Amino acid sequence: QANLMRLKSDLFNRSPMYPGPTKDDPLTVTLGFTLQDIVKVDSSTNEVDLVYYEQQRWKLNSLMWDPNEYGNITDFRTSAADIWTPDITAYSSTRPVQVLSPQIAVVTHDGSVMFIPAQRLSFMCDPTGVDSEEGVTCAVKFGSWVYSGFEIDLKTDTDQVDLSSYYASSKYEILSATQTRQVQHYSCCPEPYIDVNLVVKFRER
Amino acid sequence: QANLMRLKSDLFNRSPMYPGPTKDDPLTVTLGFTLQDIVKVDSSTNEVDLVYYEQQRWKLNSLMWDPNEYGNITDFRTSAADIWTPDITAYSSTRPVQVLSPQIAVVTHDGSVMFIPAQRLSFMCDPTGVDSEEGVTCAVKFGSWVYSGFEIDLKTDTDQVDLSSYYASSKYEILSATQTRQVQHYSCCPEPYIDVNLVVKFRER
Amino acid sequence: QANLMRLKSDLFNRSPMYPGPTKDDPLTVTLGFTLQDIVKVDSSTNEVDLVYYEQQRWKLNSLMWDPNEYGNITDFRTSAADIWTPDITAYSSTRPVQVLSPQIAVVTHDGSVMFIPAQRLSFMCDPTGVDSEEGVTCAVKFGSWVYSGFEIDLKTDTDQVDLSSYYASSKYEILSATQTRQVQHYSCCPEPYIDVNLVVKFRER
Amino acid sequence: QANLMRLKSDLFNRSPMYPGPTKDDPLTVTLGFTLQDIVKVDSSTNEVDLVYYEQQRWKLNSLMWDPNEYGNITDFRTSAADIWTPDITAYSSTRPVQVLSPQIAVVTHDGSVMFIPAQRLSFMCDPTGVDSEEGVTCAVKFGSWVYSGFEIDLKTDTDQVDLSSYYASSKYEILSATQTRQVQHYSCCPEPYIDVNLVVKFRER
Amino acid sequence: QANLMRLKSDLFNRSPMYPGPTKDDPLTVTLGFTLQDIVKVDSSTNEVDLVYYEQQRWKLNSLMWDPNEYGNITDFRTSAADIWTPDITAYSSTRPVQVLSPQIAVVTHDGSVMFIPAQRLSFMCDPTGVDSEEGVTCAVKFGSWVYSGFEIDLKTDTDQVDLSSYYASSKYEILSATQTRQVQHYSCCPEPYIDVNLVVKFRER
Numbered sequence A, B, C, D, E: 001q002a003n004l005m006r007l008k009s010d011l012f013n014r015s016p017m018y019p020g021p022t023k024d025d026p027l028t029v030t031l032g033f034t035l036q037d038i039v040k041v042d043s044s045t046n047e048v049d050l051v052y053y054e055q056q057r058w059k060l061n062s063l064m065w066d067p068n069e070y071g072n073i074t075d076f077r078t079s080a081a082d083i084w085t086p087d088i089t090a091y092s093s094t095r096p097v098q099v100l101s102p103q104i105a106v107v108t109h110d111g112s113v114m115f116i117p118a119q120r121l122s123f124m125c126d127p128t129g130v131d132s133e134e135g136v137t138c139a140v141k142f143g144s145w146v147y148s149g150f151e152i153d154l155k156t157d158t159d160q161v162d163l164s165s166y167y168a169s170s171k172y173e174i175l176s177a178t179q180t181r182q183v184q185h186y187s188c189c190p191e192p193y194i195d196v197n198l199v200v201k202f203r204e205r
């Protein structure tokens, strides 16, 4: 019990906190989605609501430690306030994201951080033709708001979204769901900005 | 009056706070539900609202004390911010939980903590056939979001939900309410996670 | 001006804060209600909204002072964060209470504290027969959530609710409003709990 | 640039903050109202919503300074957190006030403070006869909740509300708007309380 | 990594924070708008909702640094709390602005700051004749609430609003969108106040 207390004190209280990634010291964030439900569809304003949980995984050299020196400790859970977290944002959002999970992450001895946030997102989607047998398709882009491609890079373990936890008695059934990596070029800035496209094809009843 | 002041100072201000349970030092939480009302039912989005107060108790060796040394003090009330609390979360939730009770807990000399939070939860539930004499059945699982089975375990004193405080003039009548223990395996993670399944069978009038 | 500054410094900054009442050192809280309006009535969910301001006074030996020593100061206003406040809660609520007044209280040299919070409460009430000449009757109980009868007692100066500030052009007119002290017994615990039952008889127009 | 930095440091960081007005050291707050819009009218609950920006100015001897000593500085803008602010509250409110302007005030060398908060208030108002050519009249009171007349007093520069900034294409047209001072006597307390009565006469179309 | 840490410590922790612009030391803030969607239109209350992200850039002599002294660092990302930000406010707003982007800005060695906040604003707009081929026109002014013309001056790089990121399948199509600089004279104050008028002409389908 005392060994875990001194590990946290040596990592956070002793050393100064991480000031984000540089173009000289970049970072790579692994992502992945778990779709749970398509709760609401509004035809009069063209905005659809989703319930899901995202995967936020990365590695830091500052968070590395030897388990033998701290009594065979391999990993530990800590508050999200104690460590740095990436600024992944949904671009086509209409209303601010509602958090449905605690703000805790888990760190491993190799310096790898794991954070899984539960969310309710309202985004821009035209649902014309949801009643037909063919269905309707909608998409949303996720990525850093401030960091470019030279500071933060995104990767996906699989291109298929996990639907094993999707709500059986939902008002809308999923036909296809994919998570694919993209490289954007905005008119504002010459620097490219990497993102992940969440594409969902759904139909009524 | 001075004896209670020095007990709190010796426990919190002197000793460092608990860093959560480890696989070497696990914890067991006792969970219990008191259903008060089924306030709203939405057919167009399949989401139902419940009013209830949950029961959560655990024991810690750090919170133990001798009553004779502190002037025969057996127990005391303290703010939830002063102590560690488990991360019990509802999985099938659609919107964030609303707290309806103060953030206070009561600690005993044996190191046992008692916390009773009042909540209003909106979760995924298809209410097709609530008007019928047979009624409709719905469920929701509660458990830790970050800690696995090796770190946190759950237990229930009884499998029957307390309906002695249920609202008499409610729009819906309860037919059966049960709180049963479960051990889950998710597609994400090899570690098994323990939860409590709340199952309610209700009907109109 | 300097005399009021040193009085607050001697009471709060010098002495440690009150750790709540004990079974050896109990407290008695005086409670009052001033009904202002019955703003909303929902028939589909059986929940009613009230606008009112509650009265709460209690005395503490720690907050006592001599006026002659601090330049004839009899009383002073201070933030609710600087002092201890009772955990009075409404039991039959469906949604969290909305505060409509500042978080300030007034303390007197005898150690008596005065706190008057303005609130908007939505509680459980069946409004069937509000349109009739007879009207409809509803009740809500206010009491401590954590402290038992041996720790906190409740008393009322009068059993008649103050309706002198009730809204004249309201959609609902009051026929009778009473505040009475009652002792509850919960199956959970052997300790009895005290509350104040707010009973209101109202009619449409 | 350095002169403004040392002025703020000498006033706030050096001297202790103002503990509010006393019966020995009173304060007078000048109030004003600029009506912008009557956005919503609810007939089923008798509650009307207004968009406006309130004016409040007071003087403090502690905030006085010599401009020649600090490089000809006459005034400066500062956060509302850095200084004391009066507890002006709307009495007939139904839901909490929404702030629509930044929390900044401007202080002058004579110790005079200027604060202009933009608000959206929902208050008690019966709108029966708004569709009539005569229109409907409603009123709301503003004043201190805790300090009485002997501590804080209120005054108005003019009795006519500023409608020069009122929304032209609004659903409701103003017929008359006045701001008048009052002295209210409460049964609770011996000290009388001062307020300002905002009376508005409006009609539909 | 250590070079970026000592740069932030030398700029913020060592030197006192900027106390805003003076009439002796004024500031010029460049403003821009990127319209994304016209999500909702309410005819019963005359209030329209927009989704967009604002551009704001200014320069400060205090935030200047030599890149060679800190290991060739040209720029860095930092929290909006660490630096001063202008008080740009929408005047015709009906409800508080919702933030849809992280609170981070990017500072360059020349002392130039870049801040891009994503927002959802509800403002006063009469939508009578949106169904017609001609459409309907609406405007909203943006500018400082406390600082005048002598302290803060606003400028625009172009008078044409960026519609390259506007939602294709929106319920309303844009006919014209312009951002123009204005100098307003209010009845309250002899001081002139500068704003940017955002004028949008839109039609249904």
Ligand SMILES: O=C(O[C@H]1C[C@H]2CC[C@@H](C1)N2)c1ccccc1
Residues within 6 Å of the ligand: A144, A145, A146, A186, A188, A189, A193, E055, E116
């Ligand atoms: O930096 C900018 O926008 C940032 C980068 C990318 C593009 C949008 C979002 C936030 N991610 C910017 C700078 C000047 C003008 C417009 C946008």
Ligand SMILES: O=C(O[C@H]1C[C@H]2CC[C@@H](C1)N2)c1ccccc1
Residues within 6 Å of the ligand: A034, A055, A116, B144, B145, B146, B186, B188, B189, B193
């Ligand atoms: O750890 C994860 O999710 C946690 C554990 C369990 C499962 C959901 C909830 C939160 N409780 C995770 C790890 C990789 C991918 C997806 C989820």
Ligand SMILES: O=C(O[C@H]1C[C@H]2CC[C@@H](C1)N2)c1ccccc1
Residues within 6 Å of the ligand: B055, B116, C144, C145, C146, C186, C188, C189, C193
């Ligand atoms: O202590 C408990 O509930 C408290 C005391 C009383 C009864 C409700 C409310 C909060 N006031 C409790 C403890 C275990 C199981 C059930 C209730």
Ligand SMILES: O=C(O[C@H]1C[C@H]2CC[C@@H](C1)N2)c1ccccc1
Residues within 6 Å of the ligand: C055, C114, C116, D144, D145, D146, D186, D188, D189, D193
């Ligand atoms: O102090 C009180 O109410 C305050 C003063 C005035 C009246 C209402 C509002 C708040 N302004 C009080 C004290 C005991 C009993 C009733 C009211």
Ligand SMILES: O=C(O[C@H]1C[C@H]2CC[C@@H](C1)N2)c1ccccc1
Residues within 6 Å of the ligand: D032, D034, D055, D116, E144, E145, E146, E186, E188, E189, E193
């Ligand atoms: O200073 C004032 O209002 C400020 C300046 C401008 C005008 C509105 C908004 C906020 N910007 C004021 C001062 C006395 C009476 C009314 C308004």
Ligand SMILES: [Cl-]
Residues within 6 Å of the ligand: A101, A102, A103
């Ligand atoms: Cl949390």
Ligand SMILES: [Cl-]
Residues within 6 Å of the ligand: B101, B102, B103, B104
């Ligand atoms: Cl609380």
Ligand SMILES: [Cl-]
Residues within 6 Å of the ligand: C101, C102, C103, C104
């Ligand atoms: Cl407050």
Ligand SMILES: [Cl-]
Residues within 6 Å of the ligand: D101, D102, D103, D104
């Ligand atoms: Cl602010």
Ligand SMILES: [Cl-]
Residues within 6 Å of the ligand: E101, E102, E103
């Ligand atoms: Cl943020």
Ligand SMILES: [Cl-]
Residues within 6 Å of the ligand: D169, E124, E125, E126, E138
């Ligand atoms: Cl208009």
